Design a protein around this ligand. Structure first.
Ligand SMILES: *[C@@H]1O[C@H](CO)[C@@H](O[C@@H]2O[C@H](CO)[C@@H](O[C@@H]3O[C@H](CO)[C@@H](O)[C@H](O[C@H]4O[C@H](CO)[C@@H](O)[C@H](O)[C@@H]4O)[C@@H]3O)[C@H](O)[C@H]2NC(C)=O)[C@H](O)[C@H]1NC(C)=O
Ligand SMILES: *[C@@H]1O[C@H](CO)[C@@H](O[C@@H]2O[C@H](CO)[C@@H](O[C@@H]3O[C@H](CO)[C@@H](O)[C@H](O[C@H]4O[C@H](CO)[C@@H](O)[C@H](O)[C@@H]4O)[C@@H]3O)[C@H](O)[C@H]2NC(C)=O)[C@H](O)[C@H]1NC(C)=O
Ligand SMILES: *[C@@H]1O[C@H](CO)[C@@H](O[C@@H]2O[C@H](CO)[C@@H](O)[C@H](O)[C@H]2NC(C)=O)[C@H](O)[C@H]1NC(C)=O
Ligand SMILES: *[C@@H]1O[C@H](CO)[C@@H](O)[C@H](O)[C@H]1NC(C)=O
Ligand SMILES: *[C@@H]1O[C@H](CO)[C@@H](O)[C@H](O)[C@H]1NC(C)=O
Ligand SMILES: CN1[C@H](CO)[C@H](O)[C@H](O)[C@H]1CO
Ligand SMILES: CN1[C@H](CO)[C@H](O)[C@H](O)[C@H]1CO
Lengths: 392, 390
């Protein structure tokens, strides 16, 4: 989408995976979807260094709406859980230096059953803009036809444009096309800043594996589509929650960097380990994800329960990720000729190699003919950065 | 098995899950299966508090053997990887106040292809006794009939007895029989100190779930046969390795205590986090596992992606575990009438309840009328101990 936005993948926080559609503020007040949750989350985004690291968008997902539109046919926030309204929330979020994301649905209802946007595309776009919304995630439930789906996504893109407000447009269009026909990603890219391709992540290594395997299986179809202004969205970061081991968290962070994924954390910033916070705030890995060239990486090799992925970076640099998919035993040795990496460009005539994950350590100069040897933990990833050089 | 051993579930360390059949001492000298690996583990078991916590059996799994028997037809350890031989390693381990476990196979080869014990059961038992072995894990590969399987497990049990040395006898008899015939656990218990029931564990939450689900599905057949001298073995503890989140590690420790499982760690004692060490050494949870009554716990309830398990303990106490199997969202609320716990006696007229996992915290007195409410992390477990006030 050519709106000047998302020139690097968008970074922020989105409530869905960790908080879902919890409406019971009486018995579960700390996890119900409420304006207080987002206000406190904004405070922590500032005070715990998230904003500084690049996480700028504080995003509301489904279940913020009142059950029905107001007298003027406009959407309203739930009166009990959002009594002060979205415009006041956005004012608060902006006063913290952050940006506010909201959610809506292309069809007659949101996936959780709340008012849908079909018939109100321009009204809803203008409403969000008046409120100060800076990002829209547009879901695909309750759409009567493929034609409705595509028309609605295009219409909402145009209607947001007409407001004159800069609004990141996050689409689930390709995901909801798969029951019927395969997506045309040139069109989607025309209308969307990023798009969900695959099933929702949950708090499990099984889910990470499913997402990565779908992505690498489909990579000839999606990798080259991505670039500044339009990204593939493999769904939220779930680091900091409950179901991933440390090595599985490292794998998610590394591979979302490789994939030029939007980085939307879905966790509870009020209750997050120092290890998870340091990984999510890792400056060198975020710099890979945010590389200005904006070319998505890919799976280079797979075999013997190993994977090698790589991503071309600005200035003849490359990121390389090695995944050990064997889920038994200990760290496994993996060796590769550096000439096989980065299309034989990364280390011609030499490269300086820095390991970034699981721990940061300089590995040194590797000439074009040399071999790189690593050990990778089960379900873990070694992430390396290669800097092309003439020196040594 | 009435040999006076395994009166509580055996506790120790077993190389297989973490170190497997790594024979490459040239390129991986610190991880290959060798005498040096077991000496290093023995030293740390003493110096890092594992033995004090109760972990006593340092166990060798498959791939210790030389490719062939010796001139006299006996098993021998690999001459390069075990240059001083098993008897000498057992001497060292005994000098640390520990016990040594070894591995053999009822069939013609071990699962990894080394010499099997079929046709050599008495020689092999006497060899192990002469070496000072304290425990035998007896695998089931390369056995061509259910009759040979059964007769081999019984024959080795008897041959061990006949040596006169006390040797814990760990069998895989049910696991290898189950595809073809339902095992008779009364008979198995007669011949074995503990027995593997289900597929090998690996370093994954998926494996833990599979083991728990098989155990609760089969619990009417296996729970009552367990007790002092004879335990169900749901396989190694893999806490401290790579594949489990903290809450999944908590779930494994809590449920292996509920199940009166043997506690064979398979990890790298040289490289283990302080938090994994503290969980594996948790005195209150080990005390539940090691409860002298030796009554195996069981699944009480399942529904809404929660499970409740409980275990009766000595002196009117009970342990209760609540598992959250929903793998999305946040800590999820579960409540249960305490009159539903411990068959209705745990908290009649009242009980004091202490949470042990994920953190220790006294919850207070609960009357017979009360309800217990808790939030359980996704894939995590809350483990409680209830003491009747009477
Ligand atoms: C509504 O839609 C219209 C188009 O459909 C959209 O305007 C388009 O997008 C951007 C607006 O920022 C324009 O692209 C810029 O064009 C100028 C003209 O030369 C360039 O100098 C700009 O380059 C800078 O920014 C780029 C990032 O966008 C960098 O890559 C670059 O290196 C420079 O730093 C940039 O290309 C584009 O020309 C228009 N197209 C039109 C007007 O036809 C508009 O923004 C949308 N409105 C809203 C509110 O979303
Ligand atoms: C070979 O097989 C035989 C037959 O199965 C086996 O003999 C059994 O040994 C056990 C333990 O040595 C005996 O059980 C003991 O019986 C005596 C009876 O005098 C009891 O005093 C023992 O009590 C122990 O536990 C008490 C609490 O329960 C404690 O006070 C104390 O710690 C006691 O040690 C215990 O119940 C069993 O009677 C015999 N059975 C027969 C038929 O002899 C033998 O051990 C096996 N040998 C080898 C080398 O495996
Ligand atoms: C399971 O095995 C046990 C022992 O092999 C059987 O129990 C024995 O049965 C005989 C005759 O019925 C008795 O004389 C023994 O005293 C029993 N031993 C014990 C320890 O109880 C049992 O019958 C077998 N069950 C099945 C279903 O085959
Ligand atoms: C996809 O859509 C774009 C824009 O409408 C169009 O130019 C392109 O030809 C389409 N691709 C196919 C295969 O139809
Ligand atoms: C071992 O091999 C012999 C020779 O083929 C065979 O007769 C015997 O049944 C085998 N034993 C087992 C337990 O498979
Ligand atoms: C079902 N919706 C949910 C809101 O109800 C989340 O936004 C999810 O990402 C989407 C499915 O893709
Ligand atoms: C295949 N063997 C392996 C040794 O080869 C491990 O002992 C495993 O526990 C058993 C199967 O249950």
């Amino acid at each position: 989408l050519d709106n000047g936005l998302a020139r690097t993948p968008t970074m922020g926080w989105l409530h869905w995976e960790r908080f879902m559609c919890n409406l019971d503020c009486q018995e579960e007040p700390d996890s119900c979807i409420s304006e207080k949750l987002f206000m406190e989350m904004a405070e922590l985004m500032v005070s715990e260094g998230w904003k500084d690291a690049g996480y700028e968008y504080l995003c509301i997902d489904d279940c913020w709406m009142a059950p029905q539109r107001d007298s003027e046919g406009r959407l309203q926030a739930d009166p009990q859980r959002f009594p002060h309204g979205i415009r006041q929330l956005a004012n608060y979020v902006h006063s913290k230096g952050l940006k506010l994301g909201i959610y809506a649905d292309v069809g007659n209802k949101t996936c959780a059953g709340f008012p849908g946007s079909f018939g109100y595309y321009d009204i809803d776009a203008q409403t969000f803009a008046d409120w100060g919304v800076d990002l829209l995630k547009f879901d695909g439930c309750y759409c009567d036809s493929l034609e409705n789906l595509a028309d609605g996504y295009k219409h909402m893109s145009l209607a947001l444009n007409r407001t004159g407000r800069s609004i990141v447009y996050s689409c689930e269009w390709p995901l909801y096309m798969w029951p019927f026909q395969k997506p045309n990603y040139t069109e989607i890219r025309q209308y969307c800043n990023h798009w969900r391709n695959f099933a929702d992540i949950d708090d499990s290594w099984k889910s990470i594996k499913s997402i990565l395997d779908w992505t690498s299986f489909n990579q000839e179809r999606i990798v080259d589509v991505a670039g500044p202004g339009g990204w593939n969205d493999p769904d939220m970061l779930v680091i900091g929650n409950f179901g991933l081991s440390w090595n599985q968290q490292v794998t998610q962070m590394a591979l979302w960097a490789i994939m030029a994924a939007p980085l939307f954390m879905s966790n509870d910033l009020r209750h997050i380990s120092p290890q998870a916070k340091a990984l999510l705030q890792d400056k060198d890995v975020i710099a890979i994800n945010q590389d200005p060239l904006g070319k998505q990486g890919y799976q280079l090799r797979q075999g013997d329960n190993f994977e090698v992925w790589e991503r071309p970076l600005s200035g003849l640099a490359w990121a390389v990720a090695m995944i050990n998919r064997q889920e038994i035993g200990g760290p496994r040795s993996y060796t590769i000729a550096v000439a096989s990496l980065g299309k034989g460009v990364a280390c011609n005539p030499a490269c300086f190699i820095t390991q970034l994950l699981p721990v940061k350590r300089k590995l040194g100069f590797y000439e074009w003919t040399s071999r790189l040897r690593s050990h990778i933990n089960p379900t873990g990833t070694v992430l390396l950065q290669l800097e092309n050089t003439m020196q040594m």
